[PDB]
Amino acid sequence: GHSYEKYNNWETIEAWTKQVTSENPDLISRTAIGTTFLGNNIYLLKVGKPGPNKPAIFMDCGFHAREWISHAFCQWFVREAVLTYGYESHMTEFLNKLDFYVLPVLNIDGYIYTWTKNRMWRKTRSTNAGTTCIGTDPNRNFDAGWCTTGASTDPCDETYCGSAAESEKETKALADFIRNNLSSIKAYLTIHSYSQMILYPYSYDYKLPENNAELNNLAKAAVKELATLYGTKYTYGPGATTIYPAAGGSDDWAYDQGIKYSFTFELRDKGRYGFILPESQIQATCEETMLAIKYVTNYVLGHL
């Protein structure tokens, strides 16, 4: 069975996407936006009070297989949306005015692999010509300074950038969806762990984005808000200087598509448990992250 306070395997998350939609058709629609290399269904949940010509925020989780708290957050977010709509004024306004496109797990094949074989797997599970080595790093696979820095051209490496930008079915599916909905998508949020950071462009170069001041102020306010709940301290800034250079990232790509609010979240912790964050921290991690996500949503909505 599914639990919001445990890590759930893909079979369970999939059944959950169907169940939560079936139980809340007036707040959620489910579509598949493509298949993974191994033929799993890439679900996208449109969360919001349905209506004509609404703006949108796009959020994905599960780019990287071992970052289990990421997957857990997208599920937590959806329950908060459906349970508090109509009761909590902010979420009610959010869902009335805009849609959240929530992609609960992008790299499903890798996620399944962390359950069945190797808990520390990161990449996709696609084959590579000429080698037995498996997988591409999805967050090096976007057309954003592709493979120019902080990425490897070797399929056997953890940061393999792929045979070409969008070579992976999963990243092509995500990019295709965003390109087809650029007019409506006002913010792009991509959830990773760990490090307790909010990052914004750029990661493929040390150059700063045109609205750097605004993004910094927004990130600063969001981390302050997150800390109000349990005292958890986040840092923030441009990807390249705040953590390390990493070309081909989805946040940089989305930004260069014209989505002016583009953020990578790095959730708990700072290395004590790393990727193996105990289930006993899921609730607190998700609740504080909610505050930051809602702060950003409120800001974006107020600036349309």
Does the protein bind Zn ion through residue 66 (CB under 5 A)?
no
266 annotated active-site: yes
Residue 159 contacts ligand 578 per CB under 6 A: yes
The region of 27-35, 40-48, 57-65, 174-182 touching Zn ion under the rule CB under 5 A is 57-65
Residue 268 interacts with ligand 578 (CB under 6 A): yes or no? no
Residue 64 interacts with ligand 578 (CB under 6 A)?
A: yes
Distance of closest approach, residue 165 Cβ to ligand 578, in angstroms: 14
Q: Which of 166, 168, 170, 266 is catalytic?
A: 266
Q: Cα–Cα distance between 284 and 76 in angstroms, integer?
A: 11
CB-CB contact of 177 with 33 (8 Å): yes
Q: Is residue 272 a known part of a binding site? A: no
By beta-carbon proximity to ligand 578, the closer residue of 109 and 251 is 251
Q: Is 199 in the site for ligand 578 (CB under 6 A)?
A: yes
Distances from the Cα of 273 to the Cα of 45, 206, 209, 269, angstroms: 30, 30, 33, 7
Residue 64 contacts Zn ion per CB under 5 A: yes
> Which residues make up the interface to ligand 578 (CB under 6 A)?
64, 139, 158-159, 192, 194-195, 199, 203, 239, 243-244, 246, 249, 251-252, 264, 266
Residues placed in the known binding site for substrate: 64-67, 122, 139-140, 193-194, 244
